[PDB]
DNA sequence: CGTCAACAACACA
DNA sequence: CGTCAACAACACA
C-alpha cells in the first residue's frame, strides 16, 4: 500500500485498519498513538513448520519415555 | 560374564537372572524357553538425550502455538 | 539389486 | 570489540 502523506511527514511504523473484503483496494493508516493519518491504496505456509515441529516433538517424547 | 557351558552347547541368546547386590560376582543363565543352563562369573547417560528431546519439544510446541 | 531383520509408530484392549 | 535491539523463555496474574 501507498500514500504521499506517509513520506511527507514523520513516520516509521504505522497501524493499518482494514476490512478483509476491502484489502485489495483501500486501507486506513494510523499512528502508533492512534491518530488517523490518511488512507492508502493498494498499488500451508507456517503450518508446515507447526506440523514438522509436532512430529519432532512426539517421536522424541516417546523415545524419552522409553 | 563367562562360562564354558555357553560355548560348549547350542546358544545364541540367553536370559540373565541376577541379584543387584551380586552382579559383581555370580549370575545365572537361562535359555529363551526357560531352561536353566549354568551360572556365570564376572571376569546422566540416556537422560541427557531425554532432556534435550524435552527442550526441542517444548520450544517447537510454543513456536507452533504462536 | 534383492531380501531380511530390526526399530518405530499406530492401533487395539 | 562494544552496544543495542529484538526474540524467546520464564514468571506472574
- Cα separation, A58 vs A65, in Å, equals 10
Burial of residue A50 (number of CB atoms within 10 Å: 0-12, 13-18, 19+):
middle
Sign of the torsion formed by the C-alpha atoms of B19, B23, B27 and B33: positive
Identify from A49, A60, A65 which residue to disrupt to test chain B contact, counting B C-beta atoms within 10 A and taking the largest count: A60
Q: Residue B54: name the closest of A19, A57, A26, A15 by CA.
A: A57
Our CA-based measurement puts residue A44 at a distance from the nearest CA of chain B, in whole angstroms, of 13
Q: Which nucleotides of D are covered by protein (CB under 7 A)?
A: 8-10
In angstroms, what is the resolution? Answer: 3.7
End-to-end CA separation in angstroms for chain A: 54
- Cα separation, A16 vs A37, in Å, equals 10
Q: For the packed helices A46-65 and B46-65, what is the interaxial angle rounded to 10 degrees?
A: 150
Q: Residue A61: name the closest of B27, B9, B51, B32 by CA.
A: B51
Amino acid at each position: 500500500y501507498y500514500n504521499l502523506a506517509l513520506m511527507l511527514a514523520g513516520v516509521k511504523k504505522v497501524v493499518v485498519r482494514f476490512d478483509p473484503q476491502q484489502l485489495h483496494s483501500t486501507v486506513y493508516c494510523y499512528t502508533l498513538d492512534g491518530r488517523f493519518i490518511c488512507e492508502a491504496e493498494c498499488l500451508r505456509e507456517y503450518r508446515r513448520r507447526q506440523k514438522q515441529l509436532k512430529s519432532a516433538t512426539k517421536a522424541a517424547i516417546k523415545a524419552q519415555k522409553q
